[PDB]
Design a protein around this ligand. Sequence first.
Ligand SMILES: Nc1nc2c(ncn2[C@@H]2O[C@H](COP(=O)(O)OP(=O)(O)OP(=O)(O)O)[C@@H](O)[C@H]2O)c(=O)[nH]1
Ligand SMILES: Nc1nc2c(ncn2[C@@H]2O[C@H](COP(=O)(O)OP(=O)(O)OP(=O)(O)O)[C@@H](O)[C@H]2O)c(=O)[nH]1
Ligand SMILES: Nc1ncnc2c1ncn2[C@@H]1O[C@H](COP(=O)(O)OP(=O)(O)OP(=O)(O)O)[C@@H](O)[C@H]1O
Ligand SMILES: Nc1ncnc2c1ncn2[C@@H]1O[C@H](COP(=O)(O)OP(=O)(O)OP(=O)(O)O)[C@@H](O)[C@H]1O
Ligand SMILES: [Zn+2]
Ligand SMILES: [Zn+2]
Lengths: 611, 471, 471
Amino acid sequence: YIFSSDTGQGHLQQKSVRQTTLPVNIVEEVHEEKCYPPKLDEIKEQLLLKRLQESASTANRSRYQSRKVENMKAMIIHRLKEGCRLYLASDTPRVPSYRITYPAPIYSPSINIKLSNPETAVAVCNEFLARNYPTVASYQVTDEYDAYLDMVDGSESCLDRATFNPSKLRSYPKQHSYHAPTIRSAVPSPFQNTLQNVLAAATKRNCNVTQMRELPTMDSAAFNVECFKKYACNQEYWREFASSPIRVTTENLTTYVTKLKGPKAAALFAKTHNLLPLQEVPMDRFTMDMKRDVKVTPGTKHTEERPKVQVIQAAEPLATAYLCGIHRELVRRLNAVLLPNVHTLFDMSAEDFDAIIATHFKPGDAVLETDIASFDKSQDDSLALTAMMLLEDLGVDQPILDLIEAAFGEISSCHLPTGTRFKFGAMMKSGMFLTLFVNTLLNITIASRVLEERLTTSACAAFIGDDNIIHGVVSDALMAARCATWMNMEVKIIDAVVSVKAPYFCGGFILHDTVTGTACRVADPLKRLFKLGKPLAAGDEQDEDRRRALADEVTRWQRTGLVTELERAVYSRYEVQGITAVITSMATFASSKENFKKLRGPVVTLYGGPK
Amino acid sequence: DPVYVDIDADSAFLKALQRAYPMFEVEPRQVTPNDAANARAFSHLAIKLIEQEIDPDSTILDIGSAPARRMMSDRKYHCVCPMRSAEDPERLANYARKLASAAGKVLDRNISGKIGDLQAVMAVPDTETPTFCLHTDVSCRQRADVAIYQDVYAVHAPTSLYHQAIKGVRLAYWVGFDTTPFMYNAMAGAYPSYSTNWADEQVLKAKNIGLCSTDLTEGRRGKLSIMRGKKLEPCDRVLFSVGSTLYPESRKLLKSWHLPSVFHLKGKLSFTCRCDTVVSCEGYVVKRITMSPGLYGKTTGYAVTHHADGFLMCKTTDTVDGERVSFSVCTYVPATICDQMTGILATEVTPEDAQKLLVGLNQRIVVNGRTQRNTNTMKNYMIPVVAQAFSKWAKECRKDMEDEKLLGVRERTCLWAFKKQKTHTVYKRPDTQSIQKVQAEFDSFVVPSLWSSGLSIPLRTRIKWLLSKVP
Amino acid sequence: DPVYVDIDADSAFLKALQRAYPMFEVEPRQVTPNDAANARAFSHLAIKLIEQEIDPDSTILDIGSAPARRMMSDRKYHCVCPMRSAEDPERLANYARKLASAAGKVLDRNISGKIGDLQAVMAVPDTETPTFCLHTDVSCRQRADVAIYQDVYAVHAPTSLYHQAIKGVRLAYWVGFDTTPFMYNAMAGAYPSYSTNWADEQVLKAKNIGLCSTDLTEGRRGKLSIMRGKKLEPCDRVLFSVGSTLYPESRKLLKSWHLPSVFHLKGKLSFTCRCDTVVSCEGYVVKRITMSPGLYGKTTGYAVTHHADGFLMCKTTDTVDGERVSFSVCTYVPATICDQMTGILATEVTPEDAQKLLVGLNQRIVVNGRTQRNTNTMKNYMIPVVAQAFSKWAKECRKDMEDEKLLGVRERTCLWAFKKQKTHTVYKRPDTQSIQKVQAEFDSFVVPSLWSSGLSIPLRTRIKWLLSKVP
Ligand SMILES: Nc1nc2c(ncn2[C@@H]2O[C@H](COP(=O)(O)OP(=O)(O)OP(=O)(O)O)[C@@H](O)[C@H]2O)c(=O)[nH]1
Ligand SMILES: Nc1nc2c(ncn2[C@@H]2O[C@H](COP(=O)(O)OP(=O)(O)OP(=O)(O)O)[C@@H](O)[C@H]2O)c(=O)[nH]1
Ligand SMILES: Nc1ncnc2c1ncn2[C@@H]1O[C@H](COP(=O)(O)OP(=O)(O)OP(=O)(O)O)[C@@H](O)[C@H]1O
Ligand SMILES: Nc1ncnc2c1ncn2[C@@H]1O[C@H](COP(=O)(O)OP(=O)(O)OP(=O)(O)O)[C@@H](O)[C@H]1O
Ligand SMILES: [Zn+2]
Ligand SMILES: [Zn+2]
């Protein structure tokens, strides 16, 4: 997710495109990446398969999958191209674009410090938890009978416009096997797929009705786009972009499918026999998915109240494959119209982010961080109109806009195992292929309107998802009065000062180095610490990608000139002392395969076995 | 000015009626849970249209002649009331009872004249009176200008029209069902919009049609009979069921009302006639006929029918009294359903797949990624037979393209002996006409010149005794 | 002064009608659910345009017209009304009844003069009258300046025009169907915009055309005929169907009205003539002809037609009475569909693939449904035949590119090869022209004389009684 996940896969790429070998900033030109067209070959597969049988040590098998997957990719292109005959177009001359590059970052040396006995590391971590979090360290006294306790008490829900069968509401637990954790953090296990959990998750009541597409709604949207184009964008690209539309093209589909992996291509291939046309695919029908992981934050709140259940609304598989070739062009056009001091995390890597903010943040500087998650976007219909107006200005072809618009109105969801039907009104968060883009556009628009001209005169601004940071801005009564037109809790704002109250961004800390004198971003150690106290399901063999992720994260923590700063940042955020010992404990855990085995224990089986 | 009909306020038949009669205002007012409400609403509106385009001070002859319906009116009606059915004794008593009760209260209409008129007929059954008679259509002697037929299927059209023409009648009307399916020589059919089902007498023991009844059997490998079969063809006997009422009819009389565009009546006097259709709504039609003296012009002998919605006729296999037999059925299809299956029928589809799409199309259709509800539904008991017909049509069209012949020539191969192909489905799409050949010259007329009165003494006493007690 | 038309307020024909008549402002007003509303709407507007541009206080001839629809017109009309057809008794009786129905209500439209004129003609049937006549087009003796033909197909145009020019007519007008399909020697066709289908006599038993009928059969092996066949060519008899009305026509008279640009009439007197097309809308044209005395100029014998929509003709295979044959079918295509198919016809396309694209295009033009539900720019019963035509056209255009030849020379093998190629589709795109070679010298005019009264005694007596009273 964004920077890096627990398995070190992340959402960002790993190729630098914003690096230069000169001590000054240089403007360059954006180019295109050529893609190899797949080709079909059956005679090679037949002979290789027979040659696979006679001798295959290690690389002989790999040639078979590469040949087999390559055949599947060619077949998908041939079938997919025929469906969208009424929307296919050709290549028109492109509009050139330019971008700015920055010099490479400088880092301080790192020294490794670790203990020897792995059991002592567990004792230190347990001592740290008890001293700082007394209630959390005394919760576990028996096994994990959460499923049984949830069945004993009844079902409480707050639904709206839903139907279900009462005869299928039964929640007797099934077999559950896991490994007993060693760290005394009480991280819950993922929930079981039952009808009771589905109703508990859908306990949200956002029933609000306003003017759908009337005159007052249009007036608010018209003002919003005016502020965005006046305080956050330059005027050198609008007229050129309107002349050249964006349409579905063979190159878009060929490039997209080639980027998929093995298993993903096979899954898509299985749904190409009865291929519906593009105009036949419904755009307002979704399916319900439950398989998720619970989210826990440092503190003592999960030992008193049960956490919520996460859900996913999945769209049609063919809908996200026909039109997913226009995401790259939309990103390029958006980056071209933004001001040089306004940045977006799309199409960057970890190193590029460090080089941009290398010489901007210094001690004693005020930074404003604001999130917009706590806001009901379903109350006002103008939030959807504003996004469409921005999309139309960017140069989206007219019939394609109708297909996109159909997914932002009335939608329905269904649960296949139980046949449960749900209906929702205007919704912004979903599982479609424009979710981050629309959220980023709305985040910039909200900030631009509230801050007015204070956004233009700034040193560095970064926007991604629902989080943002703006340099050199404080909190005054003018923004409170402007934002209090409807209510007061639209957004949450926090004031931060470098080297005194470290700013928080995307689950990390922004710190200023001492030896070199440059800014850098590091991860959150407490978030990792609670995560090692999560039970591991039996039969899982993913205990090697996590060790490498921990090893990389530990090295970044032990850089010289950042030990003292990290201590103060954690204390000013969570009011906790003594994290250097925890970091040392993490170092010895991620040193060998056998040292990582001390975080687990004997296997415990519940609700299973007729003995 | 507004017109009220006795149908439900949330019925889907309101839109069909409004489009058929754009010169009126229609509002619903339900007071009776009748099983044939739709069939009566059409007839009620038809009479108002008919009596609006004709000037007053003219005499109208009524053939069906239910006197109770025409009691409260301003036009002049001459009801021709024979006694040949079991309906007649009840209607005559009802007419007398209403006339006695309506005396005095109503003064605008000729209530006193009608009451005295009925007594005169009761005195001697052989007087031609201004407003009543007991003769047939042929034997009536009163002269008028306009003749009206309402749901009459028991007379011969060329013979009945000629006898009316010689008395000086220049305009006629006919309200009834469509006779197109009976010109295709079918076995069974349906009118799903009016809850009407008809079937031949020979197939009354079927299992999977609209009008049949069967029993349960365990099977029997061997059974004999008393006569040889080998042929099952339609006969001259059919049965009609309108909601819950049974009406037996005959094919010969039904086909006689499918008149051509122009025809000549030649006898002692000669006339020239024309026939047009002015109103059509899902099975009911209204026909206007004009007759003029003289004999000049020319005829071709063709009949043309215009289809506003789909019309199907296919071949089905069904079990009749335990034995598998095959015959033909016909029905109607809404136009919206036909238009939405144009692209599907471009290939070959199994009957199972066609049934699935038809059920889905009956509830929702996706347009440009948006789902909307269909407001034009059809009865669910006709879907299986319709799906079978569509599958046969798709296969036949594909085989024609795979075999292309030369232009302007035909392959008769010597002694000709050309080969004929097989046809199992006839499908008439919306906005398509059907043409057929009929007879356009008539010169033979026969009359049973004898007068017999079916009126009975006990019925006369009751009617006389009922009218005596004036209010 | 807005013009009222009898069409639905939500029909798509209103936009096309307004475009063809920019000088008028038109709004709809529906009072009758006719099945040929579009055909009658065009004719009503055409007469209004002609009357506006014609010189007032002039005398006009009407050929084969109904004298009831010119009653309330201030223009001077002389109606030539013989009794050849079978629809004349109704028209003449209606004219007499309407004249007497209003004798004092209107006091300026020369109602009394028309009534008095009708008195004299019914007395002696051979007299002339400034407002009525019972002769033919080549027998009327009154002289005037303008002649009008409205939906006339039963006369020979060069012969009729010459007789009119002798009396001193210098301007004529014609309204009717387009003659272009009949100059290509087509076998069947349709006009989808006006709900009109026409077919030849020999293919009335087809299966998948606009005007046909058939019946179910199982198919047998071998059929012994009576004489040789092996020939299928168009005959002289053609059947038309407008809405629910039938009209028989002949090809020779239809093709005589496709006059060239310049032609000469030579006889006792000589004239020079020109023909131009004024209004064209999806199948109806209005033609204007000017006649001048003298003989000088030059002729080439060519006719030019300008296409605003697409014109298509192709070869199709069907079964007639159970036997497979092949003939040709023609139809019209809207311009918008033709424009959007340019990119697909660059390669070879499968007929089923083309059919799906056409359905998608037609269903997508609606781009709405909150207000206009589902409206189509093309009738769905013509899509199958149109889709096949494009498939053959694309195939034929490919072969020409791999068979390039030298410039200015012809490829032969005396003893030459001179091989012809197959042609299965003729496609005229919008903004193109078609040219034909016709005759331009006429010098053979004959009159059959032998004029007959054409009136009967009952008809004369019945009419005279109708207007025998002053009120
Ligand atoms: N096939 C057929 N249908 C008829 C006949 N007479 C009437 N109907 C139809 O039956 C429908 C209802 O009949 P009504 O007009 O109410 O006359 P009724 O005697 O009261 O008959 P019921 O109402 O059924 O008791 C009419 O609308 C007709 O369409 C007939 O003689 N033959
Ligand atoms: N092919 C052909 N078409 C005709 C002829 N006469 C009229 N039409 C057309 O058919 C259309 C239908 O008109 P109708 O329903 O018959 O009513 P109308 O225009 O008042 O004329 P009539 O009823 O025939 O007296 C007319 O508008 C004409 O355009 C004809 O003789 N031959
Ligand atoms: N020749 C006739 N002239 C006038 N009216 C007739 C004639 N024949 C029958 N009717 C009338 O038709 C009405 C009913 O028709 P019919 O006698 O056939 O009754 P039915 O035996 O039930 O058969 P059906 O199903 O045809 O009605 C009666 O009112 C009868 O007076
Ligand atoms: N020589 C003529 N001059 C003027 N009018 C004529 C002439 N011949 C026919 N008509 C008129 O044509 C009209 C109908 O055409 P026609 O006489 O050929 O009979 P039809 O078969 O009913 O019509 P059509 O042949 O067009 O199908 C009649 O009203 C008639 O007055
Ligand atoms: Zn009588
Ligand atoms: Zn004359």
